[PDB]
Amino acid sequence: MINAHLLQRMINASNDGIVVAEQEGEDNIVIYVNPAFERLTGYSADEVLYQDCRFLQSGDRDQPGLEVIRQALRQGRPCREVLRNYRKDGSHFWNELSITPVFNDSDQLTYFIGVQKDVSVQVKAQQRLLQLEQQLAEVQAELAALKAT
Amino acid sequence: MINAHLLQRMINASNDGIVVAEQEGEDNIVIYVNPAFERLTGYSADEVLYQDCRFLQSGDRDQPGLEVIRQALRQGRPCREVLRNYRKDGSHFWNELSITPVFNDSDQLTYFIGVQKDVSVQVKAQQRLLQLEQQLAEVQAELAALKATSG
Numbered sequence: 611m612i613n614a615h616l617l618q619r620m621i622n623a624s625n626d627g628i629v630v631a632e633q634e635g636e637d638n639i640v641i642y643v644n645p646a647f648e649r650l651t652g653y654s655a656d657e658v659l660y661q662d663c664r665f666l667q668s669g670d671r672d673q674p675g676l677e678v679i680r681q682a683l684r685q686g687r688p689c690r691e692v693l694r695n696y697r698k699d700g701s702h703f704w705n706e707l708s709i710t711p712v713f714n715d716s717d718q719l720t721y722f723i724g725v726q727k728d729v730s731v732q733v734k735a736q737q738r739l740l741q742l743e744q745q746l747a748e749v750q751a752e753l754a755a756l757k758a759t
Numbered sequence: 760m761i762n763a764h765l766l767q768r769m770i771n772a773s774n775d776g777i778v779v780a781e782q783e784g785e786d787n788i789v790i791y792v793n794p795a796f797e798r799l800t801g802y803s804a805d806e807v808l809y810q811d812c813r814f815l816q817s818g819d820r821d822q823p824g825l826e827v828i829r830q831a832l833r834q835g836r837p838c839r840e841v842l843r844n845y846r847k848d849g850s851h852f853w854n855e856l857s858i859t860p861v862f863n864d865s866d867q868l869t870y871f872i873g874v875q876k877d878v879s880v881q882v883k884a885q886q887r888l889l890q891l892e893q894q895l896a897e898v899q900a901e902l903a904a905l906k907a908t909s910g
């Protein structure tokens with residue numbers, strides 16, 4: 611019970627970035643990008659159109675989530691993986707990418723919808739957390755050893 | 760250059776929740792909710808529809824960000840604040856709410872779009888981080904004291 615322009619003004623208001631691609635060959639050529647995508651990646655919507663997103667891995671290919679995504683795109687199944695991507699200015703950021711296949715009610719053929727969340731904050735937090743836990747364990751072990759004497 | 764049901768399948772695929780409300784009086788009655796909202800809040804979409812979202816603050820109406828939102832609702836300007844909300848089962852979760860106004864081709868229109876992000880995970884980390892940092896400091900002090908009496 612809502613208007614189309616309302617749906618569009620919703621998609622503009624998204625925090626996480628959103629992309630829509632047609633599986634046209636081995637690549638997934640992008641036919642739409644929302645403004646949040648432009649803001650996160652720094653890439654202009656006109657720059658991205660009719661291409662595959664693999665360019666966000668500017669030199670950091672071979673991350674295993676890529677193979678996971680390959681399998682998910684082959685089987686027509688959704689997926690969610692964390693990658694290291696690179697903006698226009700080369701800024702490295704962590705990207706929780708969630709891909710959903712979309713079939714039509716008249717045909718079990720596909721469109722792919724991608725959603726990118728900048729987990730960079732969260733990831734740095736987790737890494738720091740693990741480092742600090744290691745440190746704590748270290749100090750506690752040495753204190754126990756000394757206490758033994 | 761894309762289809763309408765395509766936009767609908769897009770908004771359904773969102774991780775963060777999305778709500779659309781018409782500013783009707785003091786309340787902001789919601790006319791639409793996306794599935795991410797149902798999943799995050801646990802409330803049934805049919806229960807929420809012709810009501811206002813203030814029910815998510817099950818008594819925790821003393822959070823100050825609310826006043827900010829009130830002012831933002833008065834002047835028709837966007838806003839974003841973090842609140843502690845409560846699902847149907849009462850489980851407390853942290854909610855980054857982002858509100859954007861939407862006007863008609865006549866500048867005087869009343870639509871509000873809300874976006875809810877579940878920051879709970881991040882928040883717990885920070886809390887654990889602080890707590891954990893405390894623990895480390897404690898141990899580091901005691902290990903010094905013993906060594907101070909060993910040589």
Ligand SMILES: Cc1cc2nc3c(=O)[nH]c(=O)nc-3n(C[C@H](O)[C@H](O)[C@H](O)COP(=O)(O)O)c2cc1C
Nearest residue numbers: 631638662663664666667676680693695722723724
């Ligand atoms: C809809 C969609 C969005 C994607 N978004 C990203 C992205 O933001 N960053 C990224 O590194 N890969 C993204 N990918 C993955 C690449 O397009 C590509 O599928 C992946 O790198 C594996 O393909 P390849 O082995 O040919 O490189 C996306 C894929 C799809 C289908």
Ligand SMILES: Cc1cc2nc3c(=O)[nH]c(=O)nc-3n(C[C@H](O)[C@H](O)[C@H](O)COP(=O)(O)O)c2cc1C
Nearest residue numbers: 778780787811812813815816825842844871872873
């Ligand atoms: C679109 C929209 C979404 C909202 N979502 C939430 C929410 O998820 N949680 C919450 O505590 N308040 C939310 N609010 C705020 C309440 O609806 C209400 O405006 C706020 O509590 C202040 O109004 P009050 O002082 O009358 O309670 C939302 C408001 C709008 C307009």
